[PDB]
């Protein structure tokens, strides 16, 4: 099973953290976006329009089953992969890393190199609150180990995933 599952909203790190973590481990790294992308052939956009959110989901939620019992790795969750009941039953019993972000520095990490984000509209970030709202309770039920990446360098984060995951 997975040494670690990260999960956790946009910006919070788990592709960051995945990397760096798999490499401190020197073990695999699995993302399911990138699995469902690479089991279909059809990109996570294309299913959501051809075949909608259920189908999506169920998809992932079997490709996520799959990676619990067969990655040994580090894997990395798709933001609603939580969403799904099913994923929610499959990961218990798991080492389950929830990536805390706030939705200040959400919002920031993923708003580009641009120096002034406001300018944009306040759309982007009412969407990125919303997001948070639903998700993070999710998230907060999911974790066995909760890790707030708020003002921490991915080395720091790193750090103190380890000390927390030793043999
Ligand atoms: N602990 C951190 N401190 C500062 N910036 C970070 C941290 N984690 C991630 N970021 C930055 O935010 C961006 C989004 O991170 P990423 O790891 O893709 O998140 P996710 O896969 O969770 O959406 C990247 O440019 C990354 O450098
Ligand atoms: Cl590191």
Do not use: C, W
């Not at 580009?112 to 406001?118: D, K, Q, S, W, Y």
């Amino acid at each position: 099973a997975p040494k670690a599952v990260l999960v956790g909203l946009p910006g919070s790190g788990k592709s960051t953290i995945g990397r760096r973590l798999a490499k401190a481990l020197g073990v695999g790294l699995l993302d399911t976006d990138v699995a469902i992308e690479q089991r279909t052939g059809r990109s996570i956009a294309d299913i959501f329009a051809t075949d909608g959110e259920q189908e999506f989901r169920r998809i992932e939620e079997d490709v996520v089953r799959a990676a619990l019992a067969d990655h040994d790795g580090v894997l990395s969750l798709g933001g609603g992969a939580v969403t799904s009941p099913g994923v929610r039953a499959a990961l218990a019993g798991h080492t389950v890393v929830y990536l805390e972000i706030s939705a200040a520095e959400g919002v920031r990490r993923t708003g580009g190199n641009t120096v002034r984000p406001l300018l944009a509209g306040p759309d982007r970030a009412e969407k990125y609150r919303a997001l948070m709202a639903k998700r993070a309770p999710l998230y907060r039920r999911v974790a066995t180990m909760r890790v707030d990446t708020n003002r921490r360098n991915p080395g720091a984060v790193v750090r103190h995933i380890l000390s927390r995951l030793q043999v």
